[PDB]
Amino acid sequence: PCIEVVPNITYQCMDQKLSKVPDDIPSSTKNIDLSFNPLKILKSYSFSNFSELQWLDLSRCEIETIEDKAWHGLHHLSNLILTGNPIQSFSPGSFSGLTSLENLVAVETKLASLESFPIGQLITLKKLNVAHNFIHSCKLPAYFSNLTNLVHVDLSYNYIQTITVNDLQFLRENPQVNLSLDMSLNPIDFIQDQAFQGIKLHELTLRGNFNSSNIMKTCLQNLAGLHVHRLILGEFKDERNLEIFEPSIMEGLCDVTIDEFRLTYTNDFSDDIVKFHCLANVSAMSLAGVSIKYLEDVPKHFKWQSLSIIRCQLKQFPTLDLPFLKSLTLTMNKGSISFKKVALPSLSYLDLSRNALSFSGCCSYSDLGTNSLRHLDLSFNGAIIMSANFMGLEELQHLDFQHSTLKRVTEFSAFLSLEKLLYLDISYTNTKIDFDGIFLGLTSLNTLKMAGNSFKDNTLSNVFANTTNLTFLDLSKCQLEQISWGVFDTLHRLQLLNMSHNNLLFLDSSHYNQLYSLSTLDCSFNRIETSKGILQHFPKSLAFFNLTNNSVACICEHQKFLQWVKEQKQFLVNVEQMTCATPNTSLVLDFNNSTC
Amino acid sequence: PCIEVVPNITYQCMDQKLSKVPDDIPSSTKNIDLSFNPLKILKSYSFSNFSELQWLDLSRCEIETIEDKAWHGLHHLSNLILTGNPIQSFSPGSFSGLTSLENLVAVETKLASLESFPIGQLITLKKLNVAHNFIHSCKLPAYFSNLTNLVHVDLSYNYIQTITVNDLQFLRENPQVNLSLDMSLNPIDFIQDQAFQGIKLHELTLRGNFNSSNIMKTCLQNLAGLHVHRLILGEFKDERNLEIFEPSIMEGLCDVTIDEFRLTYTNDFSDDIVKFHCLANVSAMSLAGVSIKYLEDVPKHFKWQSLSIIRCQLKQFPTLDLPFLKSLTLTMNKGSISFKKVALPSLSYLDLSRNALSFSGCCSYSDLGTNSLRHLDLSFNGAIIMSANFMGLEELQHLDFQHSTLKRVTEFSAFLSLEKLLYLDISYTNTKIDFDGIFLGLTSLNTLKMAGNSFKDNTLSNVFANTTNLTFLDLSKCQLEQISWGVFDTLHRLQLLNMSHNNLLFLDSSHYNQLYSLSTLDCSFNRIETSKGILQHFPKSLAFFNLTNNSVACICEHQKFLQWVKEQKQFLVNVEQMTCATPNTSLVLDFNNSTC
Amino acid sequence: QQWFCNSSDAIISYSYCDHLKFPISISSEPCIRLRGTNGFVHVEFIPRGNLKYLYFNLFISVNSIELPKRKEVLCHGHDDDYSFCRALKGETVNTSIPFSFEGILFPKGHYRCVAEAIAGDTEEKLFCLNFTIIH
Amino acid sequence: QQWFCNSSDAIISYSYCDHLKFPISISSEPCIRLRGTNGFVHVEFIPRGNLKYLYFNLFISVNSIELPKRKEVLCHGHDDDYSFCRALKGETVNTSIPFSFEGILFPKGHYRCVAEAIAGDTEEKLFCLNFTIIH
Ligand SMILES: *[C@@H]1O[C@H](CO)[C@@H](O[C@@H]2O[C@H](CO)[C@@H](O)[C@H](O)[C@H]2NC(C)=O)[C@H](O)[C@H]1NC(C)=O
Ligand SMILES: *[C@@H]1O[C@H](CO)[C@@H](O[C@@H]2O[C@H](CO)[C@@H](O)[C@H](O)[C@H]2NC(C)=O)[C@H](O)[C@H]1NC(C)=O
């Protein structure tokens, strides 16, 4: 028939050439996809048996007519998707029956107007999407006042050319309504004078709207008197773009009040379009996919609380001294910038990942000029040379270096100051652990991710003595061959311990006797022959002991271990699948008779 | 009782409590060190026995007297070291007998004058070292014209305050003499007018000479006339003096002709001293220990043929566009710097090693502006992002990436253009080799060092099919477990294969048949139990086959291998100490008895 | 099968994958030169899933020698550069995407690229193309 | 015990290594504050070999936890910074070496450091100091 993902709950019926609904699917199903089937016409009582549906997908289903009361037993449905159906005209009470509907997706349905759109019935409606249609007007229909729960309306990819005073009349008589408007991909050249006066919006998206700089500047002026929380601006690569892009095209904006401002891709860009005076009173500033090359002479009187730089093109690390900036993201930069010392006395969050960043002299107060930093992400970067053990940054809770090249970290107690750190990731940093005091000072740490590294003489050393609060320890892929006596004796709170993908030839249970909280022990993909020690030293809290893909020696020499496997088969994972590798199938099937 | 470093040839008698030369030293030795002994007096004939002596070291022996004919028997002696003996006066005939002496070291002997030093007989003399004495005079004596083989005189750390025109008369007289003069650590405050007029020197060292910047400016001016091949200028950390060091101090140097110019540590250093017009015609330019922070000024008409920046303090990668610079060395810089475009059309030699250097976009002609690059050293640096496979640099023959973070070198054929490369080091660059065509293009390669990396699934894949001219191959410490089948068959000239320190469970002889030229195979520090598959197949040429520090199985399954170890005794490294590791000493003692 | 072109240094063709045959019309004007090309990729299809998190797996081989899997992301799901990242399942996409590239040295011979398009949210194949490049 | 001082956060002292006793008198002005210090190391001795390729092997221990072998090259053999580099076997050296450091976070305990002075060319040991710091 179809495909069954979750029994009695979720089914996939795509590209199955169905005429109508397969009406033998459980009468208690939650979610169903029927997209890409030539349904053609949607008869009445066709959906009737499924009283507990929530998600219906009828995308590109050749549908031209919705019969009156096509939805009969759907007073529980919340998501309805009708993308790419030549319905065109929606009759009175087309959606009669959906009283619990939250999201209505009417993209590419040949829909001409929101006036004729028979939705003034659906009280519970939150989101409405009418992108890719034949909508000419921008009028917010009067019935929207019955739509008490509506917050997002998508008007992308349409034919709206004017935003007039009359269009936004609904909003003007209703300043209490939290509403967002995606207005992207409309060819707008005229916005009426005083059209945006005394209106409030949550987020306004104006991407790829304007054909020339003159039209853009003119229109933004006539946005006067708008309060928006979030204004998304810019254009697309796969669209014909504004040739000349000066900062003065932004001029209209400082007659509107903006909380957060998001500029996206622009064909032309001037580095000093970000240090523009109309953006001074903004609390969050964002750049994404932007040709910015330098970010430097930003005025000190700017109110920016967060600054986000994603997939831009900086040739240099920015000079910044904004005294009120709490949060900074500079990530996925196109080139390979090196860190330049910065002064941000309010910073508590700093993501500088995925930049191939050089950082020589990491890290201490003088690098940042903050006392408040809790989150430091320097993952997926170049060479980071440790020379200072975070003096001045003891507020840190989250430190992430995964996949960066950490240098000199074994040279000294590089993390000594981080008394309050909860999370440390030094996985795939190529650190050869060489020093027993590497983790000294990490007394609060819960999570220690250090996969991919290695240890002197391939022996796991007493590096954990004082990391008492560890609940999670990943030591996978560290080429481990031997574990030192006492290494875990202090880890009383530890729950998961990953040592998969090493070269251990055996386990010794005594290594784990103090591990009273250990629910997960992953020892798979080693070369484990047996377990020495008193087998009763394995934690009674153990729920998932993974010993798959090892190489067990089914000799009488190890008769007790082999029994113990039968004994504990409830707690070992993929037990029956395990197979011997000595004298070649299987394992739970070892006997007990060759001298033993 | 003297230490014997080379029986019958070299004896070491340092810091015994000796009173004279012991006669029980073979009258056959060529070198002897008698330093740090209370010798006190050099009694006549002391050394008459040892006639074949070439090197005698009597440093710190508390010698106050050299008797007549003290050196009587020493026909062949070329080296005599007298440092630190308070022989205040040297009488005529003090050095009589040394008819072969090439190097006299009379450092800290309390000498007061060259003029009264009885070396005018020693015609073989080449190097005269009189540093650390009580010499007040820079006069080069009349008897120098008999010392026709003298090429270096060290006059350092003496009390010379002046250089006069009659001090240098000998050199003026005999312009055919190759002399180097080390004048360091002399409180020079006055050089007479015209004192260096018409005088030629190979190397002249003036480090730590001048109490003041004016004193230097004013003394350099009277170097006018000098022709020097190598001038070394500067001061010492522990002996500073120069408050300021500006281009104008360098002024007297337009009136001197310099082939090579070297600047050493200075207390102060102005960046624009490198841009000084009187250094335009200099052929080799050099900076070591220098406070220079930016090298960017350089006029494009400068003639420099090489440039050396060693242990300096550059904040940025130099901007260079010098048309005749053949060779550039920037090494051991403070901090990180990232590579920046240079345009050096003549450039053949490039050492940018040991800089924690970060290079994104390695690399092509457009990084360098050169087509004649023969040597590229990028070792001991940071992130090197491979992005271009050396197009434009097809002449390269030596390429060093040792200990740097090489990146993306596996994503394409990064050395494709390098059809002339002879030497490639990618050791410890942390490369997981998952592309068989990584060395495509390297058809002339002889030496490939790639120790301390790794391979997909720890199997040594067929990456050497086209590297046919290989003579040295280092694959040690590569976590290798398995060797693919035809992996070495093409390497007919291969002389040295280092595969020590991997995780090989066995060898298979037929991997190495087809290595017709192999003389050394290192398979130590693996976990080899035996070698399977016909043992004649090991190359006839194989002279040194190391198998020590493995874990060999002395069971009946491997009778062939074990027997074979007995007849291939001569070709196996340290067979004397190889012990068994199964069913615990020794190995070659294994006998066919039960079953086998 | 589906499309062919030849530039001054390459012949380029694609067919659908043996495992998957959902329709896409992809084309490049001009035909890709491996030395360097400025032009557009024209794409016209009806996506079988949402394109908010579109990424490609590129499986490339040169004369049977195979490069490691290559992941390329086009829509990260937040302020994306292209108009089609907002395009939904079963929506008509018609777009021209401009591009340029400087050109590296490539070995002469036969190139196989299998390019899987993934919807990173569902993690399900959107389409699959089997490119041939003879250089 | 050869010498000792105390500063606002350290008692420093040294003796010679058990197995190597060649004499050097070495001190600082002022005493070393681990917080940070600017001053001079005063060195006075007679080298057992040429100082042309002088380097140190420091073996450092913090509360018995030993750091990896640390190598500090003082004379590379070419245009070196210190006037003592040119000193020969048996030559008297009397010099004071300026320095300054800013100070990292240190315990809070007992420090051991064996400084082994090696003549790089011959690989001979010049001297060896058993240092002890209490912070
Ligand atoms: C322990 O570490 C390894 C990875 O280091 C994890 O193994 C992964 O398991 C997934 C399951 O989807 C495999 O398909 C992946 O290939 C593995 N990842 C690898 C090899 O990098 C393992 O999940 C970790 N154990 C636990 C309990 O989280
Ligand atoms: C000047 O005399 C000196 C002899 O010391 C020559 O300098 C040596 O030259 C050779 C090769 O030409 C080098 O290998 C040595 O290391 C050089 N020594 C120094 C200290 O530079 C120099 O070549 C002679 N010049 C002339 C014209 O005879």
Ligand SMILES: *[C@@H]1O[C@H](CO)[C@@H](O[C@@H]2O[C@H](CO)[C@@H](O)[C@H](O)[C@H]2NC(C)=O)[C@H](O)[C@H]1NC(C)=O
């Ligand atoms: C194969 O590779 C290793 C490099 O790791 C070499 O091992 C060195 O061997 C010498 C023995 O004379 C030792 O003194 C060194 O300690 C070893 N070095 C290291 C880093 O462990 C080995 O020499 C290479 N094979 C050959 C033939 O040179």
Ligand SMILES: *[C@@H]1O[C@H](CO)[C@@H](O)[C@H](O)[C@H]1NC(C)=O
């Ligand atoms: C071992 O089992 C655990 C829990 O069942 C699982 O999460 C983990 O992925 C397994 N380890 C490996 C290497 O597959």
